[PDB]
Amino acid sequence: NEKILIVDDQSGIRILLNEVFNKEGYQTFQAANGLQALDIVTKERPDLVLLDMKIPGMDGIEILKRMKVIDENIRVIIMTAYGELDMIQESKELGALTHFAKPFDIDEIRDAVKKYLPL
Amino acid sequence: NEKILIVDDQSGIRILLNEVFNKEGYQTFQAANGLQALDIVTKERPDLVLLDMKIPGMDGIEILKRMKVIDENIRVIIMTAYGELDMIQESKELGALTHFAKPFDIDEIRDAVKKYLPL
Amino acid sequence: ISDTALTNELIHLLGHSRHDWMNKLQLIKGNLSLQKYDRVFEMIEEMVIDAKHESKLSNLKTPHLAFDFLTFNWKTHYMTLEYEVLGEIKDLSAYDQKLAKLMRKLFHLFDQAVSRESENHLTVSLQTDHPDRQLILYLDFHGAFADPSAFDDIRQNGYEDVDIMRFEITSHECLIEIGLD
Amino acid sequence: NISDTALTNELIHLLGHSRHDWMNKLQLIKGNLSLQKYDRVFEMIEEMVIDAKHESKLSNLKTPHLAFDFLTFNWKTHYMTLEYEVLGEIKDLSAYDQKLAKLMRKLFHLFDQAVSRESENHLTVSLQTDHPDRQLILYLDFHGAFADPSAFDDIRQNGYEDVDIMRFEITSHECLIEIGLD
Ligand SMILES: [Mg+2]
Numbered sequence: 001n002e003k004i005l006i007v008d009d010q011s012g013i014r015i016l017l018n019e020v021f022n023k024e025g026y027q028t029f030q031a032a033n034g035l036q037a038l039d040i041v042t043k044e045r046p047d048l049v050l051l052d053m054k055i056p057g058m059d060g061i062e063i064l065k066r067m068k069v070i071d072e073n074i075r076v077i078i079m080t081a082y083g084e085l086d087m088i089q090e091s092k093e094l095g096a097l098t099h100f101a102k103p104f105d106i107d108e109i110r111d112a113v114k115k116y117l118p119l
Numbered sequence: 120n121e122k123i124l125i126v127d128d129q130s131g132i133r134i135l136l137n138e139v140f141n142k143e144g145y146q147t148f149q150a151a152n153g154l155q156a157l158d159i160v161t162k163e164r165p166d167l168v169l170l171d172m173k174i175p176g177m178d179g180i181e182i183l184k185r186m187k188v189i190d191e192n193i194r195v196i197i198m199t200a201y202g203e204l205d206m207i208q209e210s211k212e213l214g215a216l217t218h219f220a221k222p223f224d225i226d227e228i229r230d231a232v233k234k235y236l237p238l
Numbered sequence: 239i240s241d242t243a244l245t246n247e248l249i250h251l252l253g254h255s256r257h258d259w260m261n262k263l264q265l266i267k268g269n270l271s272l273q274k275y276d277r278v279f280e281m282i283e284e285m286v287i288d289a290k291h292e293s294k295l296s297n298l299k300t301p302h303l304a305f306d307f308l309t310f311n312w313k314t315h316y317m318t319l320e321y322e323v324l325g326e327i328k329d330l331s332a333y334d335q336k337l338a339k340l341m342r343k344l345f346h347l348f349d350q351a352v353s354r355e356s357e358n359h360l361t362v363s364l365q366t367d368h369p370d371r372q373l374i375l376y377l378d379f380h381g382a383f384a385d386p387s388a389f390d391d392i393r394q395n396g397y398e399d400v401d402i403m404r405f406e407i408t409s410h411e412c413l414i415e416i417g418l419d
Numbered sequence: 420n421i422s423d424t425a426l427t428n429e430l431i432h433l434l435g436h437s438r439h440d441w442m443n444k445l446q447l448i449k450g451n452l453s454l455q456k457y458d459r460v461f462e463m464i465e466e467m468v469i470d471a472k473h474e475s476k477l478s479n480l481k482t483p484h485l486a487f488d489f490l491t492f493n494w495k496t497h498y499m500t501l502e503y504e505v506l507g508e509i510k511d512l513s514a515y516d517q518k519l520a521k522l523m524r525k526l527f528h529l530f531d532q533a534v535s536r537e538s539e540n541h542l543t544v545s546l547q548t549d550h551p552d553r554q555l556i557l558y559l560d561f562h563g564a565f566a567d568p569s570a571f572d573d574i575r576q577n578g579y580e581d582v583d584i585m586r587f588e589i590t591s592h593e594c595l596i597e598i599g600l601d
Pocket residue numbers: 008009010052054055056
């Protein structure tokens with residue numbers, strides 16, 4: 001009954017990450033842009049959200065706030081491009097857990113989302 | 120007993136290419152630059168050469184000329200970069216048997232040395 | 239090679255290209271882990287075909303159009319572009335600006351018609367081998383329209399001396415065939 | 420907005436190089452993946468991931484000139500291979516650009532004139548941002564072979580502007596150079 005929302009503009013990885021948790025007893029919700037993500041956060045109220053920070057059309061750092069203006073309890077893990085140190089800070093300074101720069105080891109994400117979201 | 124010279128500046132492509140030709144019953148020879156290449160063509164007089172044309176330092180079309188100045192019957196397959204039409208035809212007129220752009224199917228490369236390795 | 243602004247610009251674009259490849263290494267190692275070796279191979283080839291088109295487009299002696307397509311997704315748009323070149327490479331330099339401009343016009347009509355919740359994708363195909371026209375342009379879109387009534391002007395009333403051969407638009411798709419001479 | 424007409428031609432050119440390099444990486448992977456050399460590929464990939472990491476690092480050093488220089492190095496005609504790390508995460512080295520960039524090109528020219536052209540010459544440059552005094556320290560670790568190591572003796576016997584060439588030793592097949600900036 002643990003909800004996870006995947007928010008990347010690339011299907012592949014979105015499908016990938018899914019299948020990953022789609023295994024460890026997690027109900028998974030996908031999404032391709034911020035406008036969709038909210039509605040899901042808003043409607044299905046996820047536990048953890050893995051948010052891609054460089055999606056054309058969205059200021060992840062913006063939907064990050066909104067996402068918290070909707071449920072600050074919200075547990076959000078940002079996926080970033082390596083070297084975006086300011087975005088990471090401002091973000092972790094907004095209320096996030098830990099960034100994960102792509103291409104991240106498929107291992108530690110399930111691991112890390114576990115020690116962050118026991119099921 | 121059939122000699123093959125691999126001329127590519129990148130180790131991986133070299134190690135690979137031969138970790139392929141040895142297993143096909145061949146005598147491999149590697150070369151990182153035109154000069155090393157020419158020498159081998161002088162001392163080990165190989166039956167077929169695999170020539171990378173995007174090797175910095177020496178121009179792949181100058182070492183082709185030179186390779187042939189040594190052996191008028193030298194047999195060379197060029198490994199090019201996609202879209203460089205003009206190079207394929209320049210080195211074809213200089214006696215190049217065929218070309219393979221990267222990446223390639225390591226299996227039609229084999230069929231290649233096999234199709235041009237004289238009786 | 240210089241001008242510090244220009245230099246800062248190339249450094250910046252090469253950074254975008256870098257992320258794209260990292261995403262790809264993400265798809266490669268991701269499946270590489272779930273032991274789906276036949277997909278990895280599958281992807282890689284798709285990769286070699288996209289790269290194969292980028293190249294072609296970079297060889298039509300049409301720099302202003304190539305630069306627009308190669309950078310389009312690195313800018314804040316509401317849809318993603320996928321382009322392909324159908325036919326052999328020709329010297330369409332005599333068409334660079336016309337195309338580049340026409341594409342700009344179609345490009346924003348779209349960014350002012352598409353919904354912003356939908357996952358919008360647009361495929362542009364540049365054919366260099368048509369027997370009757372010197373060049374036809376195909377646009378295939380899928381998504382959602384907020385203001386579909388934006389394509390109105392160009393539907394009845396075309397655009398310049400380009401024969402807009404077909405322009406269909408349904409609930410989530412849009413087909414356009416434009417011919418050039 | 421209408422793009423500059425050089426940016427246009429210099430992006431396409433450059434991306435055409437990066438494309439090919441990215442195709443050479445796909446050759447290593449797909450090739451070695453077909454050989455079912457399964458985990459080497461993992462090795463190879465991280466190998467790639469790392470590089471990109473410095474590509475980004477160098478970039479965020481606010482030294483566009485040194486960077487563009489280093490990134491396009493292997494797309495030009497030199498006789499050694501360049502590899503560059505950025506050790507100690509990013510500072511603002513804007514004052515240092517034009518100097519390092521001007522100095523490096525010099526050095527690079529020297530190597531092109533000093534190294535033999537039959538050997539596999541590989542040069543590694545390291546930018547260090549973590550060090551008690553010396554805002555930044557440049558390391559040059561080169562190995563290969565020289566046909567005129569004597570092209571270095573001069574800057575060796577004269578130095579370069581307001582920079583202190585700390586260590587600078589040329590052996591038979593390698594070379595170590597340390598340059599501090601404070
Ligand atoms: Mg993304």
